[PDB]
Amino acid sequence: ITRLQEKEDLQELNDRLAVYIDRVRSLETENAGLRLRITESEEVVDFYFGKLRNIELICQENEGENDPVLQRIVDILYATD
Amino acid sequence: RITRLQEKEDLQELNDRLAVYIDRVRSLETENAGLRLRITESEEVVDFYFGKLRNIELICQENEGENDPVLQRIVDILYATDE
């Protein structure tokens, strides 16, 4: 239709393709980060779980003393929701 | 010059090159949402555990005066790291 139109029919198509390579590329990097954020979370779950487990042990160890502070702690440990 | 079959192939070829990019973005955006559920589901557990540890911290702090070595052992665990 125009000599300079075929220039912007060529360029429009080129820039449309570009934004797809820029999507795949940045979707690939977001994706990589999420894989590491998932490993970091699984690590923090264990780290916290370890603490709660050792705290449970110290409480079971002192069952005899019937300290109501330890019972309050145990009530927290075995809580739900 | 342009053969009637080279214009049939140049068409299909492009229409396929574009098709593998939409199929990449698609499956990449699918994988991305599956990672997002995974990380939010893990973070929910992190928060549940964090909540207990934090409430336990408060109890040890309000009994600071008691100087109970059991509580000190407990706060030692709370502030502990692997180094």
Author numbering:
A (entry chain B): 26 to 106
B (entry chain A): 25 to 107
What does the article say, verbatim?
Lamins represent a distinct class within the intermediate filament (IF) protein family.
Three N-terminal constructs incorporated residues 1–70, 17–70 and 22–70 of human LA respectively, fused to residues 215–251 of the Eb1 protein (C-terminal cap). In contrast, the 1-70-Eb1 structure features an opened-up, ‘unzipped’ coil1A segment, even though the presence of the Eb1 cap keeps the two chains together at the C-terminus. The large differences observed in the dimer structure and crystal lattice contacts between the LA 17-70-Eb1 and LA 1-70-Eb1 structures are most likely due to the different crystallization conditions, rather than a consequence of the complete head being retained in the latter case.
